[PDB]
């Protein structure tokens, strides 16, 4: 489970973040849950399940799973969308969940 | 619905401090809980995962044996007591509640795989330094 | 002309201990070297390297290469095999050639003939053991091109030598057909399984041995503390127990971390790599003696030249990254075989005395010793089937290091070319090759269920071992044979 | 030869298969990491040469042999529990347990669990008897005797330990200085190793650190006993065709001499098989094992086992035995839980081989 | 009663690439933190790195002696440089030795001390059998190798002989 050290995109565009995974991690079909946290604040579950947005979540925030590597595509980038995103998934061999390496989306406006 | 933390402090290397999480507004028993540790500049690290009623607990590797987990159902509290802290453990600790399940194994409904943590706590800074 | 000389037979039958796989393909054969036998060497290649110095002749003949499993097994049949059986091995060969056509550059040239014959005497140089391209296509709807025959012989650098050699009744064929039957020499079953136990854990856990080992060479701390104390090898110290059999040979490979930041920032790719020398030409050791690719719980590391590496469908020829290729692991044989990236073990390098302390040294290679057991290198759906044994005064364990069945009498080389008449001309046709396989069933009474092969059930853009929207057949991953488990 | 003994078979593990790993013993070290099960079944071991309270009427004894060799075969590791060498002794039947693959103290996917109750077996009451016959496969004889075209056999060099304690180096080099081989990260000692001569002629006070077989005397202590209490065998008879375990095999050239270079040679410590080699196998002793199972494998060389005797692809089948568990009084109302209550019991009888 | 017109390494078809891939290049280029792994196809261009089924027979190194005596070192190296085998404390010279090419192709002036048709499947008597990596590589630790002075039997070996006692066991008993 590895994420890009930084992703950067301008307002009014389409930003994508993707966490590639191992067989022990995503090969099994285990769901990949995405999280966001505004800096210095408690992290909030964003995309519970493979691609579902819970009640109280913006429609533009959408993510999927293919192969071993899940992807998350934010549309209509907003200032409020600049924050740290975290890809978690269960790892079979480890027997415990493994979060990603962390990512900071950069709104270029 | 609220989840808090307490017990943080300045430990210094080599000593233990209990770290407790009191929670109200939701049924304590029906949800599985996680602890997740965050270094200041490092991604979220999942410290431990304890099932409902505390029957089965499976630690992460790094902390194995130098932590313990106790969940008291009656007072709606989650207790994580640790031991033999080094300076690599200085970081925030978030009290989490697992709900969402990786799809295919939801029917088995195990203590683990509930890595979905819908809401979780304010965190507390436990700083291990001489 | 208006007669069809053969039908299209492609299927597989599952009968008892046997499996009969029939693969038909379509081929297209152009004219090689303009009907000429031309000397080739490194000198027209430039010969920038000594170890790359070669010499030989490139000849107009083509050949049919069915030597890879992906010709004869569907990805289903390969699954139906490796999941249910301990071993397989070829029995018979039935080859046919029919529906010949000849073209002229395009219209039918109806009087032309096609020269095709087999060498059952193994007289010509045998090129089918080096795992070349040109094999029958894995997916039946693909027309394939026949590869060119050419061989190499002795040389000094670029120049030839006097001892070198140069090189047949050929049935001439568009209403004619060509067939022949070939019988395999008896070969042992390919071992498609992984042992439940490890060589060093063959002992009974609950009981002591009656043998003794030396626990203490000194009494305590001080001067003149020497004493000898002995102990029973048992459950407490399993490692020191006496053992009848020991792991097979080892020739160390340089370990390589797939995560590159761990890998050293130096050019260790060629110089670092282990190899062998023949007539003052150092040649890379590939893939080498079968050895487990990695230690327990390290899957990121792999031997530098030790394991087979397949390219993914559409992967380029040069300088493709680690994500454009497939890499095969020997992790199954970690039970009886040493790891390539680990030493064989330690020895004693001197005699101790009261003056000098004992010394040890690492064993970076170990030949055979009485009591070694080993597993050979697995074969893959994309991997070769048989290889030819060289004709030599002696050999040990002829099984070819790339995997498969070594034989002193492999399937014969099937040569084909257009009879020269020059006019631009090319022929096509049909080929149906049929191999009969023997099965070794499993009587295993193991209670807990096996590791099998599966297609992961999850929503995906495409299906594995199927055709993408342009119809390019794809084999996404290498499939080994070893899933079922045996006792040691 | 014919033999007869009296045996006593108790109830092991209270009729339970039990997962056991080094954690039950405390974990020991990396080298000692194992995983496997212990069984209630006992098994008759007569591998060695020197081998050659009210009555319950309805209690049955279960016995079978695995002639399909489908179970793990633990008789080749030279374990205790043999028939006694003296015909009037009575002995306890050893407990059968088997090891499988592991990562440390854990169990991998490959690891297999066996239920011996899943093999068909014959059940004996006190009147009934049990017999079977087994024909050995063809194996060579075991010799009991004692410009060149042939060179001596193979050799993995052992350290030279001396029987005079003063001569030895004053340090705890017993385990650190011992020849060993590496398998999946675990270091297993080389014992006894390739069959090699024990010592040069003229020195009887030196021996290989782990190469030789060592036996204990009647009633010897289990841990850290002195040298007199143990019997160290020596192979010296074979010194004619085999190199000395404590010596180098030979020497090779390290370079190409020239006007600028003196000829430099170096010691061969360990030697793989070469063509033209001839060697002797390891001798058998009255206390030593007879046969050894050849692990079913893709390839091997000179199957003769390193502890001596006769290597076999089909050794004598393991003969498995246990008492049929007899329950206590079951409760009146039905309880689905399997019965944990049994009558204290053991069985005894006669065994002829 | 013959000599091969082929060499063990050259059994390949010169006109066709293998389907195998090897490790071509470990660095993008000179620099710092350039670590990468590139794979290529083995083919007619680079033959030496192609995978092969059989490897040349065993070898036990001999000291090399020249018929032109000015080339040799000025010392009595006959016995002290001899390759011998110790038996019951008795060192016997290795003669003629395992079958090995007396000399490389092109050099007839050197002959092995106690030792040319077999050179195809048999390594030269004066040459190391190859190299073997002697350590792992780290970020801080470069790759090391060493020379193989002798090598026993390995599965997949083939060798030519040179142009039986009563014992428990033996291998390839044909006399040296």
PDB file of N, CA and C in Angstrom, chain C residues 393, chain E residues 1-3 160 163:
ATOM      1  N   UNK C 393      29.699 -38.235 -22.304  1.00  0.00           N
ATOM      2  CA  UNK C 393      30.177 -39.441 -21.642  1.00  0.00           C
ATOM      3  C   UNK C 393      29.463 -39.651 -20.317  1.00  0.00           C
TER       4      UNK C 393
ATOM      5  N   UNK E   1      34.480 -41.568 -28.820  1.00  0.00           N
ATOM      6  CA  UNK E   1      35.540 -41.537 -29.822  1.00  0.00           C
ATOM      7  C   UNK E   1      35.252 -40.465 -30.850  1.00  0.00           C
ATOM      8  N   UNK E   2      35.250 -39.215 -30.402  1.00  0.00           N
ATOM      9  CA  UNK E   2      34.869 -38.083 -31.233  1.00  0.00           C
ATOM     10  C   UNK E   2      35.071 -36.793 -30.457  1.00  0.00           C
ATOM     11  N   UNK E   3      34.885 -35.665 -31.121  1.00  0.00           N
ATOM     12  CA  UNK E   3      34.975 -34.358 -30.499  1.00  0.00           C
ATOM     13  C   UNK E   3      33.836 -33.490 -31.008  1.00  0.00           C
ATOM     14  N   UNK E 160      32.527 -34.534 -20.698  1.00  0.00           N
ATOM     15  CA  UNK E 160      33.282 -35.555 -21.406  1.00  0.00           C
ATOM     16  C   UNK E 160      34.345 -36.138 -20.488  1.00  0.00           C
ATOM     17  N   UNK E 163      40.282 -38.903 -22.830  1.00  0.00           N
ATOM     18  CA  UNK E 163      40.424 -39.671 -24.058  1.00  0.00           C
ATOM     19  C   UNK E 163      41.337 -40.880 -23.868  1.00  0.00           C
TER      20      UNK E 163
END
